[PDB]
Amino acid sequence: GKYNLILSEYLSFIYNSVQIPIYYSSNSELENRCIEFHSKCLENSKNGLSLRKLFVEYNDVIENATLLSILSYSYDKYNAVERKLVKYAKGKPLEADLTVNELDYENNKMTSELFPTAEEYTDSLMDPAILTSLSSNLNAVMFWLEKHENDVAEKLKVYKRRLDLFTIVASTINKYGVPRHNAKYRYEYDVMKDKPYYLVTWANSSIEMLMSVFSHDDYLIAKELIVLSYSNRSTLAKLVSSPMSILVALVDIVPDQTFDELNQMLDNMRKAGLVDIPKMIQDWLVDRSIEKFPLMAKIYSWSFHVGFRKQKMLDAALDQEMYEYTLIDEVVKMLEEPDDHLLRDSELAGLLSMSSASNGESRQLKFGRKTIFSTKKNMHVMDDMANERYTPGIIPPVNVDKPIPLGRRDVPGRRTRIIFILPYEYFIAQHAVVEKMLIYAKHTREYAEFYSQSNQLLSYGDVFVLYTDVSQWDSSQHNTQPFRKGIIMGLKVLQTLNLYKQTQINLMDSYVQIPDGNVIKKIQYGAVASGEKQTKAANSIANLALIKTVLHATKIIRVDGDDNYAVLIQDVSNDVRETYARMNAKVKALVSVGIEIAKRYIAGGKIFFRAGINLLNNEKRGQSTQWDQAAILYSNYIVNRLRGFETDREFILTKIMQMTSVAITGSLRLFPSERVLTTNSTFKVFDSEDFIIEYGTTVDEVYIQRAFMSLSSQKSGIADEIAASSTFKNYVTRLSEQLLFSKNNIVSRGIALTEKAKLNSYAPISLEKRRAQISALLTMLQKPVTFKSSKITINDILRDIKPFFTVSDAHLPIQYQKFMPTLPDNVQYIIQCIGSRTYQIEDDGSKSAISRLISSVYKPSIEELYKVISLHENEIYLSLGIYSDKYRILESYVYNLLSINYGCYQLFDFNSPDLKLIRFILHLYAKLEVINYAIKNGSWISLFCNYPKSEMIKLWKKMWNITSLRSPYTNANFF
């Protein structure tokens, strides 16, 4: 509710030149009243008259109806930033010491220097890649300061800190002015030409951090990073974080030389400009009390919000007898028992998987009588099959003749790594084998990433120690020979076994299409990179193989991407490092009570997670939309809050206000309301109370809820014609002809949409759908009242059960200690009372008998299993090649719809003995209600249920008719 009113301040703040609220309602009489109020408001404003009398004349509308959005009639230029910023440009601009970056262009020079001419310029090295503007951030920041310019006591101190810092940003930006952003939210050459190239990204990071400060320490930290980052753009993040690995070993629940290693980390930080942050760690080392460890964590998390190290592709590419090691035997075990049908029909499975396949070059295509630039690997199969070009038995050579294009992955505080771009023959020849490999991993604890439904908590608990950072080793030219030799050595079935082998052989000698300016060079490449199916799976096999080789009783051994550990000091560490050295491999072999790795660090016997997800600077420009960009931003914010870092929620609200609004005219924007924004739908961006999900309980919410589903999926005048060409029909039929026998169409209908659901990706479709959606969306807010609802959802089901639950105050004592100290108090309180789980809740039906039987190579989603299970015994399909399971399919479907596995709920033990407070759906509804109350009150409530026997049958029918709501942004799933 505070969001809707806050938005008013923001609009009044930006505009000084009318605001015409818009109210809707399920009530029919009120609705006409809403229309009268609305109509009169325009007239009054377009006539320069008051509106105070009208509001009094519509108290019923304000008090009893729902706000749908707030129109804004403006007539300035949105250049209020230039004017507002000056008040804060009092400080002295920063001057970047262009003598800090080993790589010239990494230095914050003047754009006109790095790129003398326009045809030479490329924001490819600093692009925020986010669909929001720098001016907006500046505007948003100014709004908060105006609002909190009079706060008192401690609140004021936050302002003084925020005020100070922001000045650094305002002062520097002011010197060069505030850069103007184009429709594509990019930053052209003319605007950039006379300004410090790395200005825009820097401002975003500085703004993101300064709007994340609260305590004094946050300020010094935001302040030191903000300043050094302006000139240092290649080691600040690495330097600030680096010592965290040694620190974990320090606290109870170390050899002299280890201490020196830490001193050097501190010195390097010091010799690099740092002052206060190094001092803080120094103070911490006097007692090394886990009680004061939270600070060390804020530093490691904060170092990430400095931005993304985006260097030139070639530079990134450039960094790249005793090999017992090439154990990599592991391959055989994973594929020993399996004439598995999967291995025999590997070609169909890989073909089907394409939806979850990597990416290839944006080839040229023709379907029917047109041309397109699709980059999706699946479509390539369509063009090739309908062109006699499709030839999987012949996997394209990846060498000098036909080199490998290149993709990339950027991450704060680490040298850029490259990603191959192999054709589709490679994915197809790798899906079945990898998939079979994973099943073995799935039940092998050594692979801490795959094992069962295991969550990071299980991994944490396992650690009766020695940890490593084999990230560089996975790309060490030395590694490729062994790695490939082992996979090949281990290697319908023979056809598949052989083809996979060839992928390795073509790779053994792989050339890279590495760009080098507006030109595409072409150098060699004797290192291994990612881009193959087997990448993540095979990489682990190698990493596990490596530690076994290196390893004066092995209690546990584990792998996890770029880290491998084992619980079995100065002598052992030396012996370990020298051993790693002998194999000529760059690695961080440490030894300790604690361990640190890329995904989680265990300092003090407590589990910690890094919290540095850049919010105002994205890694790459995907295909998401401005709206989805916001829902994604809010997702990111929640994950951070949960992990540690916390950007002020008011700021986030401001961004959502900027990011969601849409203009119908050149002087009229339409800011969607809080009800429109948070109501559970395909456009839901956030929650009206972090960590708590609501569901239509009032008539209005449901009235609007059914109304929104309507314009949820709007056809694409491209995604249909594509299925109209012989290509699509041949591809679908061709795939099916080797998958079906009887009348499969239930299966057949799904496959088509399986493609029609990703096809939008193609710009002309995503853009066509996105632009068209605006016309429908704008009109949608206008006038509805005409919908033939009949479909039911969780909202409708839950609304039914509510009245039958009797709530009464109950009490729950805190008994479980803390192990994830960063969790916000309200979240931490639930774990303290009911505990937490170290497992994921089956939300796909994968663990049902019918599914196991179907596992034919086909794989029906939870939705399909749900629809199929709801069928008559006669109809129940097993057309594929092959029970009262009916309960389990529904359970997985329901849990999926409640995101019980994502968000903060994934950290709650929903089967906690303590969560007695309740007296399948009635129960889960009972549990969610109690948990949510706990989060929003700190106290517990006990629920009683006297659901009549008659009501249960009506409800039972509803259960098998629930539809979904797509929005993927909501994605909070972090561990």
Binding site: V254, F464, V567, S592, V593, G605
Partner: peptide, 28 residues
């Protein structure tokens, strides 16, 4: 967890002493 925060607090005790002896051994 305990069986490894005590193979480090017992390789100090063990050390210092295994050495208090080495000072009784004129071995370069």
């Amino acid at each position: 967890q305990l069986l490894e925060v005590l193979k480090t607090k017992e390789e100090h005790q063990k050390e210092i002493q295994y050495e208090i002896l080495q000072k009784t051994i004129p071995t370069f």
